[PDB]
RNA sequence: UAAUUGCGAUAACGAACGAGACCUUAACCUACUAAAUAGUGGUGCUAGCAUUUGCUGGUUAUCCACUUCUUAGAGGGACUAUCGGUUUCAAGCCGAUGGAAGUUUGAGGCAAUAACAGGUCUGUGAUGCCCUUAGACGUUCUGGGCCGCACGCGCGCUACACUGACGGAGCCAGCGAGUCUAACCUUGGCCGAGAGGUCUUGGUAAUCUUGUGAAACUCCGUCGUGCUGGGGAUAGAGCAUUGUAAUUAUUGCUCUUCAACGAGGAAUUCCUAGUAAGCGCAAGUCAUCAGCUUGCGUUGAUUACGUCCCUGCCCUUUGUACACACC
């Protein structure tokens, strides 16, 4: 399937909890923000990352999410 | 100027020059293919859009890689994607679309190669996913 | 020979014991303003046309 | 002068690297002339084995390798512009073998 | 007080064991199929895929 | 019409193709319609193609297989009995002299004629073992029909002196008038037989 | 050998008077129309090909194509 | 007008290259004819007898003129197919290496083809000349 | 091909060599049923009469049958190659021969009753029988009757 | 959800191992880098064909330029992207567009706490105990046996044929391996029908076999529906190769009799896309020998996208006089 782990959504939550003003709800602004305030150590870590806080920030303006 | 074109493991190189519509393949002319069954499939990216349409350009094909079917394939892919760029690059990217809309809208892998790549065999069976007959008793 | 075929509107679920059935909420065609329930074998979606000789035959679920 | 190829195998990626990258501008830093380092293709040494000690279980087979990897660097030189800078390619695990 | 053993497998033996069968005569290992599997990666045999 | 020729020597009578309205390299391709309505998107003609070996993706999802050229799907269908697997040339060579004698007896537009014997052996009613008289799917016809067609042509031509294009020719022709003294249509009027005893 | 073996010359015009009730032409619709055996058929067609009624629909081999002429 | 051993692909050629040979009368022929099967991997020798040889000669002269030089074991692996060899499973078979190399040597003493500075035979200039012949006859007799 | 028509000179199952032959089919292979004869040698004896082998044995001579028969029964004089031959080197002469008869047989048995008179182990697995080529007996050809 | 994957409900909150992530490989990149150990064009060297100069061409020390194909390093790229429908409120799922790739992107490697009296002392100069140890159960030599045949079972190869057999003809891969104390991979000639012999040559290797000119397959002909020209079991005779040594035929080759088999009962195995199946090739076992296995590519379907009717397994509940735990 394409259900993603807890290292992927708690990261994605802890980078929007400190970085809402900051990247967009592009995935392609979303990782190369992720590249320079994130310590991820595999491109596909940080691809699953960005995208995981592109559908967070993609869904936040529909209201608020829990946690 | 210089394309590719592959189905499985063949490799067919398309060299389009300005010319007088000398299309090869081997050496021999496109009409000597000799799948026999398969002759139309080299004719696709040329009937599709005009039927003659080109007395300007020459493709010079060579396919090494693959078998009959795959390197057959692999040319008529080739020589479409060599007019795709001659037109993309020395005539205009209007036509090049133009003629790229016919092509997708007829799309068998002329121009992009198709990704299904022979998938490694694991032991305990013949094929990929096909195991040896078990027997309980 | 009477005359009659409909078209699958909604599809309900899985029906039978190995899981081959499938109910169709069907439309009729003629007598548009009619939705019958049935089973059918093959692989279904909506917007599908479908051929049934008996018209008034509630097709119910396989145990 | 004389006209010489070296020969980088190895199974270690990055000290066949450190050394074909420092070969490269140890030739610069001479302002030498030479055919950019070629990558002949991996030799992937896939061998088959049986990962039970016996002949009891299910059939499991289990495949090692051994990658081993090889460039090579032509150039010309004087004798101590290559004594000394076929002495500088000593990283354990990259083998050179340099022919004239 | 021997034959000749200079052929089959009688005339080979693994290099740590000498034990005539599985011997994995590949490469110039010339040892057995299990010390093989045993002291594989200190050859530089690994396994990856 | 439109006599075009350029420096590779071919005869115009492919030249001649699209410039008019479209056709096979043989047969004309318009004049096809479905003698039903349920059995379309399943039948999968315009688009129209030149020959029957689009070697493209039809199974990766669930109902892509309905978008292949019905004329492919009988050859894919004839790709079978374990001893012609593979050998998809001879197929599509099998389904070229059928097709011709399908023009040359009863000529009806070759491919109408296939695919009204399709439409008209696509079994309306089935059993399921549960025997409960369940209905069928239109893509079930469909594929079901062609598996009908081409193993009576298969159990046709085994073992007797018409080779298997003609097996298959005949069988076709005789599912597309309708008559029950073929395989295919006997096997659809054997399935549909327990459609009353068993509602 | 059980029929038409090498001859089928005592009703020898029945390889004139054929074309009417059948359209197509074939080695088998030949051993099928109760007349010829296909032990002579290969060559014996040809004949007819070469001069006759029937017209060529492709350059098939292992298997036949004829028309009757318009 | 620009006519060479490309523009007749496969069989037409022959059909014109094996009358050819019939036509020069030299047959070439070292008796084997309607010994040989002219491949050990083979069950039966070929059907006709008269134009074995000649087809041979053909396929071997046009082979060697679309390539480089080539070489008897060569034309041994190109010629010879698979094997019923009983129970067991089929196997590629080499052909039989005396036919491929009389014919060669009846290309040398034809002269269609010669020797090679680095091994095996290349195709000879009359010999060039004349698969061009037969080509050109091909393509203006039945296209 | 031609006029076949042939009223009264057609040929049906006919006498030849000790053995009937099927004159409805094509020489070579018709000429096989003969026991020693097989595909390759009738070809290459039919091709060596030079007869038309594209003909069946109801019309093709009523000589080059005996023709051909004599080239079988001297098959090393009339320039066949000896490995050609199924019995060479008999076993007490050096010739080289062809068995064409009710006599294969007779030279089979002779060599096994022979080999049963050496006690030899060959000779011994034909009485008994058994295979004799090295064969597994543990499960193939178990009923045999 | 493939998943204790996540949402979510919630005396739990926050986590850790496992799963995932990770690594290897297979897909793409007219982007960087560098390549007569890879390839491509243009100048001469050029033989044909045509001759307004063009088709195919060879030019392995013959000229320059280049990196599209090939190769391999660093990177890029996918994260189900976007848009709709369904989502209880989400996790997600389903379509379409685009994309090289949308099913964990495909296939693997790695695989927690653990349980088996599962197998292995016949792998080990791993080893407890017992036994044997000078007529040895140690080692070595000859010979035979493991292969032996009233029969039963399993994994398989070849078939029952015309979608086929047989002949010429087309000439289409990838994974690899291959010798300096030396006989390994063998190119090219001559002989033989063939296996094979022979005089050489290249290769310690992207360099030579090898472009593995594989097979199935494709073209045209012979066969005509026959227990047949399908099938090659069985056996006879002869020639070589491997080996000190082919008898109980190692194998190959030539000729010859040409068995069952008319598609398979009850049952039963494997499998969802480059996958099943058909096809052969390489490697391992090797002095020789595949019908075996490990990988590889050529051709490429049918049906399904669901379920708990069967089997297996997991979790939960439940009973226990068990706790060495149902032996
Ligand atoms: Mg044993
Ligand atoms: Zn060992």
Redesign the interface.
């Given at each position: 399937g394409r259900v993603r782990t807890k290292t992927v959504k708690r990261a994605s939550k802890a980078l929007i909890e400190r970085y809402y003003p900051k990247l967009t709800l592009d995935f392609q602004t979303n990782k190369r923000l992720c590249d320079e305030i994130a310590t991820i150590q595999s491109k596909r870590l940080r691809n699953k990352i960005a995208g995981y806080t592109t559908h967070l920030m993609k869904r936040i303006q529909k209201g608020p999410v829990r946690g | 100027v210089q394309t590719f074109g592959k189905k499985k493991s063949a490799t067919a190189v398309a060299h389009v020059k300005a010319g007088k519509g000398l299309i090869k393949v081997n050496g021999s002319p496109i009409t000597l293919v000799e799948p026999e069954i398969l002759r139309f499939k080299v004719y696709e990216p040329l009937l599709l859009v005009g039927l003659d349409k080109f007395s300007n350009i020459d493709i010079r094909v060579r396919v090494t890689g693959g078998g009959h079917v795959s390197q057959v394939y692999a040319i008529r892919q080739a020589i479409a994607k060599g007019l795709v760029a001659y037109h993309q690059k020395y005539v205009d990217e209007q036509s090049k679309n133009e003629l790229k809309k016919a092509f997708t809208s007829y799309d068998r892998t002329l121009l992009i190669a198709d990704s299904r790549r022979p998938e490694p065999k694991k032991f305990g069976g013949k094929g990929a996913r096909s195991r040896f007959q078990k027997s309980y008793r | 020979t009477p005359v009659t075929?409909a078209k699958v509107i909604k599809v309900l679920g899985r029906t039978?014991?190995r899981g081959?059935?499938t109910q169709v909420r069907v439309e009729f065609?003629e007598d548009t303003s009619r939705t019958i329930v049935?089973?059918?074998?093959?692989?279904?979606?909506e917007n599908?046309?479908?051929?049934?000789?008996?018209s008034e035959?509630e097709?119910r679920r396989?145990? | 002068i004389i006209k010489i190829r070296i020969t980088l195998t190895s199974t270690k990626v990055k000290q066949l690297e450190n050394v074909s990258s420092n070969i490269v501008k140890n030739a610069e830093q001479h302002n030498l002339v030479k055919k950019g380092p070629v990558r002949l293709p991996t030799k992937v040494l896939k061998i088959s084995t049986r990962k039970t000690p016996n002949g009891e279980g299910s059939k499991t087979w289990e495949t090692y390798e051994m990658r081993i990897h090889k460039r090579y660097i032509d150039l010309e030189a004087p004798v101590q512009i290559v004594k000394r800078i076929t002495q500088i390619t000593i990283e354990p695990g990259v083998d050179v073998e340099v022919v004239v | 007080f021997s034959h000749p053993r200079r052929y089959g497998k009688g005339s080979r033996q693994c290099r740590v064991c000498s034990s005539h069968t599985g011997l994995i005569r590949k490469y110039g290992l010339n040892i057995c199929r299990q010390c093989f599997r045993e002291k594989a990666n200190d050859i530089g045999f690994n396994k990856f895929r | 019409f439109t006599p075009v020729v350029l420096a590779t020597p071919i005869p115009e009578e492919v030249q001649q193709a699209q410039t008019e309205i479209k056709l096979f390299n043989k047969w004309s391709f318009e004049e096809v319609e479905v003698k039903?309505?349920?059995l379309?998107?399943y039948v999968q003609v315009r688009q129209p193609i030149f020959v029957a070996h689009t070697a493209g993706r039809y199974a990766n999802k669930?109902?892509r297989k309905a978008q292949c050229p019905i004329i492919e799907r009988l050859t894919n269908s004839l790709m079978m009995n374990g001893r012609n697997n593979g050998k998809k040339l001879k197929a599509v060579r099998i389904i070229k002299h059928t097709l011709d004698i399908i023009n040359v007896l009863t000529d009806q537009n070759p491919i109408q004629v296939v695919v009204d014997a399709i439409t008209n052996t696509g079994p309306?009613?089935?059993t399921?073992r549960?025997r409960?008289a369940?209905?069928?799917?239109?893509?079930?016809?469909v594929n079901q029909a062609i598996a009908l067609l081409t193993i009576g042509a298969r159990e046709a031509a085994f073992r007797n002196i018409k080779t298997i294009a003609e097996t298959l020719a005949e069988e076709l022709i005789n599912a597309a008038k309708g008559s029950s003294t073929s395989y295919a249509i006997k096997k659809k009027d054997e399935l549909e037989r327990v459609?009353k005893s068993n509602? | 050998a059980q029929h038409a073996v090498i001859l089928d010359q005592e009703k020898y015009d029945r390889i004139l008077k054929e074309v009417p009730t059948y359209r197509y032409v074939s080695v088998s619709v030949l051993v099928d129309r109760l007349k010829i055996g296909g032990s002579l058929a290969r060559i014996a067609l040809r004949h007819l090909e070469k001069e006759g009624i029937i017209k060529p629909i492709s350059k098939h081999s292992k298997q036949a194509i004829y028309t009757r002429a318009t | 007008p620009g006519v060479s051993v490309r523009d007749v692909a496969a069989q037409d050629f022959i059909n014109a290259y094996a009358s050819f040979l019939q036509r020069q009368g030299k047959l070439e022929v070292p008796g084997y004819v309607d010994i040989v099967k002219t491949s050990s991997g083979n069950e039966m020798p070929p059907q006709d007898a008269e134009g074995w040889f000649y087809k041979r000669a053909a396929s071997v002269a046009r082979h060697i003129y679309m390539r480089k030089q080539v070489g008897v074991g060569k034309l041994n692996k190109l010629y010879g197919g698979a094997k019923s060899r009983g129970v067991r499973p089929y196997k590629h078979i080499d052909a039989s290496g005396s036919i491929n190399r009389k014919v060669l040597q009846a290309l040398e003493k034809i002269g269609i083809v010669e020797i090679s500075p680095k091994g095996g035979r290349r195709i000879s200039e009359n010999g060039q000349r004349d698969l061009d012949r037969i080509a050109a006859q091909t393509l203006e007799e039945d296209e | 091909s031609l006029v076949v028509q042939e009223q009264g000179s057609f040929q049906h199952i006919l006498r030849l060599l000790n053995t009937n032959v099927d004159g409805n089919i094509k020489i070579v292979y018709a000429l096989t049923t003969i026991k020693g004869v097989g595909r390759r040698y009738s070809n290459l004896v039919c091709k060596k009469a030079d007869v038309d082998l594209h003909k069946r044995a109801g019309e093709l001579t009523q000589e080059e049958l005996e023709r051909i028969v004599q080239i079988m029964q001297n098959p090393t004089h009339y320039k066949i190659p000896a490995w050609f031959l199924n019995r060479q080197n008999d076993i007490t002469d050096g010739k080289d021969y062809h068995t064409l008869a009710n006599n294969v047989e007779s030279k089979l048995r002779d060599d096994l009753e022979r080999l049963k008179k050496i006690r030899a182990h060959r000779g011994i697995r034909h009485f008994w029988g058994l295979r004799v080529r090295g064969q597994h007996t543990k499960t193939t050809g178990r009923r045999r009757a």
């Open positions: - | - | 075929l039978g014991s081959g059935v065609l049935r089973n059918v074998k093959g692989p279904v979606r599908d046309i479908l051929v049934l000789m008996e035959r097709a396989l145990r | - | - | 039903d309505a349920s379309v998107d669930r109902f309306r009613e089935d399921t549960v409960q369940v209905d069928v799917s239109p893509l079930r016809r459609a509602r | - | - | -």
